[PDB]
Structure 1
Amino acid sequence: GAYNEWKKALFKPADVILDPKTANPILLVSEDQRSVQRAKEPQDLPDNPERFNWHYCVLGCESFISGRHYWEVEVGDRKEWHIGVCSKNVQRKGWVKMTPENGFWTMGLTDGNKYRTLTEPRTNLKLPKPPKKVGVFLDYETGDISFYNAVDGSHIHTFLDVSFSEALYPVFRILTLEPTALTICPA
């Protein structure tokens, strides 16, 4: 459909690979750096400045300061996941609420069937069909971050008219221990 035929004409396909130096020590990044899982217990890793030490987050390796970009994430049958973008300068040490005011523009799924945007306060989304693959779209200049069901092209949510000033990274968060990983589709 139009989603597949037009996406690359409007947005540059980003080749997103996960940065293991950023990942909370309870997360495992796959060898190909496209997939993340959770461990039962935190692994023994350095508390280097780029690493999230409280939130169960990991970033892409590259950030964006201009332009239109997109990437796609296979969420599959996971019961919990959150994805989107965040500012380079978010607080990675200690707790902050993941909200736009704190530099995070994310949405996702909790408790198997509760879709939300991570706003303040959180907003519930009503999705006709549960997505298995989600497209994340950034237009830096217009300030729009938009999420689509990447199989049927349906709209999930858009953060409108944000005034970005910092570089933006893809961000991924998983809280639960489940058999299915969260995985980036290669460009």
Structure 2
Amino acid sequence: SLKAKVLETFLAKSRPELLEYYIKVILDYNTAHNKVALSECYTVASVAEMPQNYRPHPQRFTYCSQVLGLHCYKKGIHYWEVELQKNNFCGVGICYGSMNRQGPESRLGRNSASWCVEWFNTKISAWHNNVEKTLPSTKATRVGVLLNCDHGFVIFFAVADKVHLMYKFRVDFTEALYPAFWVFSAGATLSICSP
């Protein structure tokens, strides 16, 4: 009975209710690891068949096959959707801009600055600050991320014929959040959804 009443509302929402909060997300070429290929107007992230030799840049992940969106949000309510190739290792999440770009601890969910849902093939996890949380398998090839910066939470939704809670974190976000993407297996691809 505080603003957990807002959280309880958002967890109940249908697709058409979440699409009210739709944002365009465009991948930031400066952040992409050498192993991550950008395509379809910077909309699709895939494991390139060989490392890409991108220029050095303070924004660029040097260690983990990761890439960030261009825009960050420190206020308002934002929803985006990402289609996954089934039977692959990838992650979809959010991170502070101050998240490290170097080291094994730059891995999405392996630090305090990042929050994600992983697929190791069929098995699904939620991660934050190097705590894993095993979840029920889903056949859904699409995740919806709802970030509420006004009332400090994020929700990961599996999106099929309907929409089902995968996980959520309440946090007092200390700075703006960037959409974050992780691709690992040869065949991994994360497509940001446009219409």
Q: 2:182 and 2:111 mapped to 1: Cα distance?
A: 18
Q: 1:28 and 1:20 mapped to 2: Cα distance?
A: 9
Aligned to 1:182: 190
Aligned to 2:60: 51
TM-score, scaled to structure 2: 0.85
Contact 1:29/1:37 (8 A) holds in 2: yes
The one-character-per-residue Cα deviations of 1:91-127 (angstroms, maximum 9, x if unpaired) are: 01223154375300111201x1111011332111113
Aligned to 2:10: none
Aligned to 1:3: 14
Counterpart residue identity of residue 14, structure 1? I
What number of residue pairs does the alignment pair up?
180
Say which of 133, 149, 155 aligns to 2:158.
149
Aligned to 2:30: 21
Residue correspondence of structure 1 range 7-156 to structure 2 within 5 A: 7-9=18-20, 12-96=21-105, 97-99=107-109, 101-110=111-120, 112-119=121-128, 120-127=130-137, 129-151=138-160, 152-156=162-166
How far has the Cα of 1:40 moved from its partner? 3.6
Find the residue that maps to 1:49 and give its secondary structure. Answer: coil
Structure 1 moving runs of 4+ over 4 Å: none
Structure 1 vs Structure 2: percent identity of aligned residues?
27
How far has the Cα of 1:143 moved from its partner? 1.5
Q: Structure 1 unaligned runs (5+)?
A: none
Q: 2:62 and 2:163 mapped to 1: Cα distance?
A: 35
Contact 1:73/1:182 (8 A) holds in 2: yes
Larger strand share, 1 or 2: 2
The one-character-per-residue Cα deviations of 1:51-109 (angstroms, maximum 9, x if unpaired) are: 01101110111111101101000014242110110001100122315437530011120
Find the residue that maps to 2:32 and give its secondary structure. Answer: coil
Find the residue that maps to 1:118 and give its secondary structure. Answer: strand
Q: Structure 2 unaligned runs (5+)?
A: 1-12
Contact 2:31/2:67 (8 A) holds in 1: yes
